[PDB]
RNA sequence: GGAGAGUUUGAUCCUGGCUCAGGACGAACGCUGGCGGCGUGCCUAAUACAUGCAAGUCGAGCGGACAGAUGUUAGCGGCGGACGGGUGAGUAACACGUGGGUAACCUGCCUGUAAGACUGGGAUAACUCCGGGAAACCGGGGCUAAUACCGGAUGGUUGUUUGAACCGCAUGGUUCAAACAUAAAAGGUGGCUUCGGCUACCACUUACAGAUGGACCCGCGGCGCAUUAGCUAGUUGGUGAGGUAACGGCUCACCAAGGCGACGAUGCGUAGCCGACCUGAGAGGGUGAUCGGCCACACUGGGACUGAGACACGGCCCAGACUCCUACGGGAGGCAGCAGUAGGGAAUCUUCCGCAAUGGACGAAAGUCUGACGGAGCAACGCCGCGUGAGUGAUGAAGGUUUUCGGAUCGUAAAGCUCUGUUGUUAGGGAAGAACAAGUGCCGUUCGAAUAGGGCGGUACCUUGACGGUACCUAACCAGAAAGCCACGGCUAACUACGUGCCAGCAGCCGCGGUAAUACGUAGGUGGCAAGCGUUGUCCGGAAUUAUUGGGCGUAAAGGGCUCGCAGGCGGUUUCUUAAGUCUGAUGUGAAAGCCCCCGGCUCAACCGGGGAGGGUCAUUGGAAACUGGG
């Protein structure tokens, strides 16, 4: 599955944009329906999941994953997520939103060190090279469409993960130490 | 009779085999002797790796190589080892 | 106690019941004796099917059946749902769940498994009373 | 099956000449028991001879072992040298 | 290269009774899986001993052999300490 | 590296139990359901089994047939059929795990080292004829070969006897020497022939090594029951003999009276065991599907034969029950091999394709056989991955739901506009997995008397894919074909309306329902997940809830009515000493897979692979000596 619903209500329950910009919490900064510590922790976890647009099984297991790490477990996990190539697509600007940048690897536009990715959940590693495939060079959303961890060359249409983050280039808003509560129940 | 055989190992469509020693009454994946090398013949080209002091070993004591451990022993040079060892 | 004392008589861990006791048996008829195996459902034949009272502060007329299960035992079922199709000689299929305030009546009928029709005009829980989904 | 119906046919075909050999080692054996019995060396000497020969026979085609046989013959040969 | 040894065991007499056969009991110290305090656990062996040397309350010596019967594995070697 | 919550009350603190949130499944059931990769799939009836298939091969051992040089195979013979495959019934046992021992062992095939392979003989299937059977078949006569069988010859074997010449753990062991007795064997194919033979290769005999597999013994470890306390009389030991590959009451005779047991014998009940697996902070508990090891079993009970190995899954023989045949006289059979059927059950698959790969049997080889295995089929049964659209878009449409009728919500959701093609459909293209073997040459080397032509090693050339035109790839077209399920009082994430009115119903718990029901049923919305979601069962956790880690006993359950004491547990001070505990080092071993760690390969992941680590109440052998235990 992916959650192809309103992006909108997301940004409104949990009272942050998602998008990042501010649009879903302009005129209506409240949750959705007629009534606009666990809920806490949910709320905290359902906002970093549904930032990066990825379902729960897959992120429980991202974050067993980054335990195995040496260092603090929710700094790691979320270094992790960033990693992922539709969050690196959308972060080196070749989309507007998240589910573009997850509908261009799923399609099959990007490459990776020269080879095609079709994985949106991919989990690139530094050195590694994100390009746009020649049949898509002239992507109309691409041409329409950056953090110092990366860098991009919008001549060439290719970027490259140079570092990991390191936590405070990520999303601000998530209380990561949360998560890892949730999780720990 | 003990014999040099692949031992098949791998996934489905991907298989990869490791050159036991083994008596020829053992069923193909189970009981065995000694480890020797691996075979990975769906790479390309088919990855082979060979530890030749067992290898030698096995064959003075006259465990017989199967067909395609021999030809993989062939290319690493064991089996010219062999034979020059048995001379001299 | 003292560690001698255990060494020479140990502790001992309690005996945890079942809660759905005819699941537990199967029965050997070749052998004419109960097997010791779990089932998560059992069939069953209906011998009667009532009306029972339940145990105050509660009031209502809920609906049960009297079972023979393919292991020989005979055992009270709940007919969960509003409105059912069993009559004697329905062939059922029960599950573990006592029914709280119905004192002997430690399982309830699956509702849309063999004879048990599904229940009719239920749109939510659907699957919980055996029910296909209304449109297409 | 063909090659099991073979080898039972076989198998009592190989049976009936055991038995040969078997009964004529202890032929010879038990001559060799009653000539020392009647205290007579020539009769039980010659007797250990052929004892022998019938013995280690059977060892040649399998159907006495090495070592049931060095059993049979020094148990004997003690015998013929407790005359 | 030497031989390989058999196993030895010093322990007590606790029977003379049998022709040519003591029965030795070995006691140790066996620690308690749970717990860890050590307990005195009691092994009787029967040995053979062709001169009935050992007598009743010995602390003889005593090494294993091949079966000398149904039960006797072992064969008297030295008396270390007799009895009183 | 370890989370709590609710519930005895009028209220309370404590004690105490119960219940829930988590994680797992060979799961099932209900509802729903797109695809791919990788696994898994009779847990019940070790019930009964239709049909097909799962073990053959060798004509370079051998006559005879039958075809037409040469090919084919009833039969004899060799080897295999003791493996591979299945199941877990029995078994509480040295069955298994771990560590040892055997100076009490056996070992076909393979490898190496040596010696050899001499000379004779009589048969007997096939065949052909005859007699009796309903059949299964079977009983007679005469023929015939063997690399079949049996004679002698010679052997380094094994006996027994006598030496010496060392050594260990009692029994003893090893190496040499002599005497005497006993012991072998085979040819077949190609070449070269001086036709006598000789040569290579395969086969044959014996000895000694090696490898491999098996056997036995022992220490130690892993169930419940005392509402099971005695148990044993080949029993325990001895002495002989017999038997065994081998030690041994293994067996028997005789003699002795022993043996085991409150450290739980014996009996009863339950169970295949292990690597592992699940859960847990760990200790621990639970499991022992798949995969690997070991054991046991093959309709049931019993016995043996052949063989290196069997008391033999697809072999004998006996007995019994059952099914099938039948001329009733006798015969035949044993899916706990792969499929499949019936039955039982909540419940578990195709009477599939190929030996291309990897193994295995036989063969000189080509091959042949192989339901091992490789593949495919079916099932959301599980794990992983990707979908079912994306950007923009108020006008905040209609519609729905709510409405203090203002509005709010569904809602940027939709449409509109602009895109994409994962997938889907269609059309091209299209793998790796393959190594080979064999045959051909050429080179080296080795045998050889013969540059003949074999062996062994190089190098070339050649040619075989079930999966499968399948994966994958390229091109074209379409947002078109692809979202459900549970919940929403608290625990617990997410609330309103209408209907119902202690009824229908819900429920895990506290409880809810008699007119304002956030708890019943429906609707809108919201929430949690998602090709799944719930439910049930079972296990572990939560349960510092059998507590060693980690609890208690004045009054909550809990101090023996009181003594005397056997065993057992425990033990002041100093010094010496040992070193059983204890601490420490080294060595051996604790398979592989798994788990964890580090890498590397599949577009990612799952999965797969490589290197490592871990894991013992472990064995062996050194140290230290305070503490515990000796003296």
């Given at each position: 599955?992916?959650?192809?619903?309103?992006?909108?209500?997301?940004?409104?329950?949990?009272?942050?944009?998602?998008?990042?910009?501010?649009?879903?919490?302009?005129?209506?900064?409240?949750?959705?329906?007629?009534?606009?510590?666990?809920?806490?922790?949910?709320?905290?976890?359902?906002?970093?999941?549904?930032?990066?647009?990825?379902?729960?099984?897959?992120?429980?297991?991202?974050?067993?994953?980054?335990?195995?790490?040496?260092?603090?477990?929710?700094?790691?996990?979320?270094?992790?997520?960033?990693?992922?190539?539709?969050?690196?697509?959308?972060?080196?600007?070749?989309?507007?939103?998240?589910?573009?940048?997850?509908?261009?690897?799923?399609?099959?536009?990007?490459?990776?060190?020269?080879?095609?990715?079709?994985?949106?959940?991919?989990?690139?590693?530094?050195?590694?090279?994100?390009?746009?495939?020649?049949?898509?060079?002239?992507?109309?959303?691409?041409?329409?469409?950056?953090?110092?961890?990366?860098?991009?060359?919008?001549?060439?249409?290719?970027?490259?993960?140079?570092?990991?983050?390191?936590?405070?280039?990520?999303?601000?808003?998530?209380?990561?130490?949360?998560?890892?509560?949730?999780?720990?129940? | 009779?003990?014999?040099?055989?692949?031992?098949?190992?791998?996934?489905?469509?991907?298989?990869?085999?490791?050159?036991?020693?083994?008596?020829?009454?053992?069923?193909?994946?189970?009981?065995?002797?000694?480890?020797?090398?691996?075979?990975?013949?769906?790479?390309?080209?088919?990855?082979?790796?060979?530890?030749?002091?067992?290898?030698?070993?096995?064959?003075?004591?006259?465990?017989?190589?199967?067909?395609?451990?021999?030809?993989?022993?062939?290319?690493?040079?064991?089996?010219?080892?062999?034979?020059?060892?048995?001379?001299? | 106690?003292?560690?001698?004392?255990?060494?020479?008589?140990?502790?001992?861990?309690k005996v945890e019941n079942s809660k759905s006791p005819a699941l537990n048996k199967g029965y050997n008829s070749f052998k004419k004796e109960h097997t010791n195996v779990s089932s998560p459902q059992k069939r069953g034949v209906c011998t009667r099917v009532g009306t029972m009272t339940p145990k105050?502060?509660?009031?209502?007329?809920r609906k049960y059946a009297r079972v023979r299960l393919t292991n020989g035992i005979e055992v009270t079922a709940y007919i969960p749902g509003?409105?059912h199709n069993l009559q004697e000689h329905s062939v059922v299929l029960i599950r573990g769940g006592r029914v709280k305030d119905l004192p002997g009546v430690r399982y309830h009928i699956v509702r849309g498994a063999l004879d048990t029709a599904?229940?009719?005009?239920?749109?939510?829980?659907?699957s919980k009373y055996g029910?296909?989904?209304?449109?297409? | 099956?063909?090659?099991?119906?073979?080898?039972?046919?076989?198998?009592?075909?190989?049976?009936?000449?055991?038995?040969?050999?078997?009964?004529?080692?202890?032929?010879?054996?038990?001559?060799?028991?009653?000539?020392?019995?009647?205290?007579?060396?020539?009769?039980?000497?010659?007797?250990?001879?052929?004892?022998?020969?019938?013995?280690?026979?059977?060892?040649?085609?399998?159907?006495?072992?090495?070592?049931?046989?060095?059993?049979?013959?020094?148990?004997?040969?003690?015998?013929?040298?407790?005359? | 290269?030497?031989?390989?040894?058999?196993?030895?065991?010093?322990?007590?007499?606790?029977?003379?009774?049998?022709?040519?056969?003591?029965?030795?009991?070995?006691?140790?110290?066996?620690?308690?899986?749970?717990?860890?305090?050590?307990?005195?656990?009691?092994?009787?062996?029967?040995?053979?001993?062709?001169?009935?040397?050992?007598?009743?309350?010995?602390?003889?010596?005593?090494?294993?052999?091949?079966?000398?019967?149904?039960?006797?594995?072992?064969?008297?070697?030295?008396?270390?300490?007799?009895?009183?």
């Open positions: 599955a992916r959650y192809t619903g309103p992006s909108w209500k997301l940004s409104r329950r949990l009272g942050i944009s998602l998008s990042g910009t501010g649009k879903e919490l302009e005129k209506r900064p409240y949750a959705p329906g007629p009534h606009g510590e666990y809920g806490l922790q949910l709320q905290e976890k359902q906002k970093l999941r549904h930032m990066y647009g990825v379902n729960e099984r897959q992120f429980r297991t991202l974050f067993d994953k980054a335990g195995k790490l040496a260092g603090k477990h929710g700094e790691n996990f979320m270094i992790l997520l960033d990693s992922r190539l539709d969050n690196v697509v959308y972060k080196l600007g070749l989309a507007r939103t998240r589910r573009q940048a997850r509908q261009l690897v799923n399609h099959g536009h990007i490459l990776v060190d020269g080879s095609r990715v079709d994985i949106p959940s991919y989990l690139v590693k530094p050195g590694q090279t994100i390009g746009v495939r020649e049949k898509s060079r002239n992507l109309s959303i691409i041409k329409e469409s950056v953090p110092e961890y990366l860098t991009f060359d919008a001549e060439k249409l290719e970027g490259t993960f140079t570092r990991l983050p390191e936590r405070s280039e990520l999303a601000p808003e998530i209380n990561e130490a949360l998560i890892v509560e949730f999780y720990s129940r | 009779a003990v014999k040099i055989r692949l031992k098949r190992m791998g996934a489905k469509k991907s298989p990869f085999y490791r050159i036991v020693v083994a008596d020829s009454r053992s069923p193909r994946d189970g009981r065995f002797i000694e480890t020797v090398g691996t075979y990975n013949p769906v790479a390309k080209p088919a990855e082979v790796k060979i530890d030749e002091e067992l290898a030698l070993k096995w064959l003075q004591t006259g465990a017989k190589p199967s067909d395609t451990v021999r030809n993989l022993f062939s290319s690493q040079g064991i089996m010219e080892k062999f034979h020059n060892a048995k001379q001299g | 106690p003292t560690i001698n004392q255990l060494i020479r008589k140990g502790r001992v861990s105050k502060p509660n009031s209502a007329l509003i409105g599904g229940v009719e005009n239920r749109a939510q829980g659907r029910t296909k989904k209304p449109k297409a | 099956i063909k090659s099991a119906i073979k080898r039972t046919k076989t198998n009592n075909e190989r049976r009936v000449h055991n038995a040969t050999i078997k009964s004529a080692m202890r032929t010879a054996i038990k001559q060799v028991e009653a000539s020392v019995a009647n205290n007579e060396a020539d009769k039980a000497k010659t007797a250990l001879t052929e004892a022998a020969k019938r013995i280690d026979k059977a060892v040649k085609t399998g159907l006495v072992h090495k070592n049931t046989a060095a059993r049979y013959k020094s148990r004997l040969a003690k015998k013929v040298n407790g005359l | 290269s030497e031989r390989n040894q058999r196993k030895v065991y010093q322990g007590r007499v606790v029977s003379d009774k049998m022709d040519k056969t003591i029965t030795v009991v070995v006691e140790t110290y066996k620690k308690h899986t749970l717990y860890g305090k050590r307990v005195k656990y009691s092994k009787k062996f029967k040995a053979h001993d062709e001169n009935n040397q050992a007598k009743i309350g010995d602390i003889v010596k005593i090494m294993e052999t091949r079966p000398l019967s149904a039960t006797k594995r072992f064969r008297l070697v030295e008396v270390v300490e007799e009895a009183v």
